């Protein structure tokens, strides 16, 4: 049955009032930080940008390390191929020279054998000459 009506304002396109059904059971109205600073805002935005830029730089540092490894694998294949050439070249020169030496040695040994036969023959001839004429 009870209701307190307090007229507030009256205007050209409006009217307002306050309707109170019950007063507050507890009297004494209710039972902050500044500002912020443009400098404080800028410091935080700059710090976040430096973090974003630092991580992008780290990604780039790692991608550059991959480029370095790429050059190192290309170089390794060049070096292994070069050592293969060098190895084959020396193995082949050694084999061709050893074979030359052995073949010329075999030819020298057989010619020396035949030359000894000639020395023996002249010695045989000597004996025949000692027997012939110098007898009868």
């Amino acid at each position: 049955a009870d209701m307190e009506v307090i007229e507030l304002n009256k205007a050209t396109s409006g009217q307002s009032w306050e309707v109170i059904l019950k007063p507050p059971s507890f009297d004494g109205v209710p039972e902050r930080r500044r500002d912020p600073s443009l400098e404080e805002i800028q410091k935080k935005l700059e710090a976040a940008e430096e973090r974003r830029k630092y991580q992008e730089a780290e990604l780039l540092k790692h991608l550059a390390e991959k480029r370095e490894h790429e050059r190192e694998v290309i170089q390794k294949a060049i070096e292994e191929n070069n050592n293969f050439i060098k190895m084959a070249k020396e193995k082949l020169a050694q084999k061709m020279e050893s074979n030359k030496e052995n073949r010329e040695a075999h030819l020298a040994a057989m010619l020396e054998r035949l030359q000894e036969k000639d020395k023996h023959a002249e010695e045989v001839r000597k004996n025949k000459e000692l027997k012939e004429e110098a007898s009868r």
């Binding site: 209701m3 307190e4 009506v5 507030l8 304002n9 009256k10 205007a11 050209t12 396109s13 409006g14 009217q15 307002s16 009032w17 306050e18 309707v19 109170i20 059904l21 019950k22 007063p23 507050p24 059971s25 507890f26 004494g28 109205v29 209710p30 039972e31 902050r32 930080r33 500002d35 912020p36 600073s37 443009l38 805002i41 935005l45 710090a47 976040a48 940008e49 430096e50 973090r51 974003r52 991580q55």
Partner: protein, 431 residues
């Protein structure tokens, strides 16, 4: 003269702005070219040019150009001047950190410069109305960046928000709870009064009251604009309640942090329906105490009121209002906190409710918007905080924010501030 500057950030903010400014033009008889065949109060929202044209006191901002490109090519291209439609090239990709720290830093000075030029045209600037989503990277990230700078440049000048609270029925990012908590923490000490609009509550009203099977942003925005219009009617017409922005705060916000009033609107009637008898003042007032008509899903029975405002519009008489309030008190508790009186501040604005011709809403002789500051709204923060906690415990998606220069400690700081907010709502309702 008491001018209000409107700021529309990101897709949600821009699209809601399109709906609001279309409705304001219909209410004041301003054509889409800014012409009007002329009670002076509309000047708080529209400035006038040398050619006799009426220009919204507004800035539209997006980090991508697509949505605003529609405003600059559309029906209202002559309503706004090109300098008040600001776009970047690349958006914030649903990432608060991207909107706040990376891309935002590129357009902030330009936005503040445009805002400053609008403020220079004001003789009694009341403050700012900021429209944005919680979920998007621009709506979340760019808005908090802008709110901080506005507090620096316009110290102790009123800032009110119309914030879109996320719903999975229409959500575009899994990360929306992260962005919502990050923006709420950063904007909290910078906003004086914020009206959250839960996309699910609006989606359900469109489905139930408007018989829309699958509501679109166009359906959601038309309904949102009606509530925005109810809230701003007495700034734009010679009203008696919420006459200045400072008055929203005085009437609804007893403590700085607990500044999230609940809006309840009635009636929402389908246009494509059989001829019916107009709802009385009693019927629309009763509809104010029905959770189904709320702009945020929550249970006022699980909370306590600290302030209640009833904003009537159209063919409304004080005698019928008082009788309606008297019947409600007899059948319902309507529990207020110990320190506040159990009551209502009522305002009647004689300007009729207006609807877009060919829209989903029926034109009504009388409507009402109740703005109440209830502790029940804490339920909306709890739902968001729980989704944040689930993902954050695993650091799911965190690398996207850290990659933009955000620190993991900011997620903890933002969440601790939300925990203190939930604790404040609990402590405020105690006795």
């Amino acid at each position: 003269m008491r001018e209000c500057i409107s700021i529309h950030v990101g897709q949600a903010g821009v699209q809601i702005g399109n709906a609001c400014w279309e409705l304001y033009c219909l209410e004041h008889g301003i054509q889409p070219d800014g012409q009007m065949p002329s009670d002076d109060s509309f000047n708080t929202f529209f400035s006038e040019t040398g050619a006799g044209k009426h220009v919204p006191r507004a800035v539209f901002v997006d980090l991508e150009p697509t949505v605003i490109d529609e405003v600059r090519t559309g029906t209202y291209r002559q309503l706004f001047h090109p300098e008040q439609l600001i776009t970047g090239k690349e958006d914030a990709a649903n990432n608060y950190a991207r909107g706040h720290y990376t891309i935002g830093k590129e357009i902030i000075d330009l936005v503040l410069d445009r805002i400053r030029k609008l403020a220079d045209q004001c003789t009694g600037l009341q403050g700012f109305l900021v429209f944005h989503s919680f979920g998007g990277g621009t709506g979340s990230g760019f808005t908090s960046l802008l709110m901080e700078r506005l507090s620096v440049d316009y110290g102790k000048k009123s800032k009110l928000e119309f914030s879109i609270y996320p719903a999975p029925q229409v959500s575009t990012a899994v990360v929306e709870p992260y962005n919502s908590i990050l923006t709420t923490h950063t904007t909290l000490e910078h906003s004086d009064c914020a009206f959250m609009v839960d996309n699910e509550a609006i989606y359900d009203i469109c489905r139930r009251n408007l018989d829309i099977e699958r509501p679109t942003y166009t359906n959601l925005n038309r309904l949102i604009s009606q509530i925005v219009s109810s809230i701003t009617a007495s700034l734009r017409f010679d009203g008696a309640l919420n006459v200045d922005l400072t008055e929203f705060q005085t009437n609804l916000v007893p403590y700085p942090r607990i500044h999230f009033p609940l809006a309840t609107y009635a009636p929402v009637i389908s246009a494509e329906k059989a001829y019916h008898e107009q709802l009385s003042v009693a019927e629309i007032t009763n509809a104010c105490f029905e959770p189904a008509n709320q702009m945020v899903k929550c249970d006022p029975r699980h909370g306590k009121y600290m302030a209640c405002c009833l904003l009537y519009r159209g063919d409304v008489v004080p005698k019928d209002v008082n009788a309606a309030i008297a019947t409600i008190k007899t059948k319902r508790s309507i529990q207020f906190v110990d320190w506040c009186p159990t009551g209502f501040k009522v305002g009647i604005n004689y300007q009729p409710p207006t609807v877009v011709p060919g829209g989903d809403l029926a034109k009504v002789q009388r409507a009402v918007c109740m703005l109440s500051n209830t502790t029940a709204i804490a339920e909306a923060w709890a739902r968001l905080d729980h989704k944040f906690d689930l993902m954050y415990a695993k650091r799911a998606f965190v690398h996207w924010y850290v990659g933009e220069g955000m620190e993991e400690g900011e997620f903890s700081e933002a969440r601790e501030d939300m925990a203190a907010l939930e604790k404040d709502y609990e402590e405020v309702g105690v006795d």
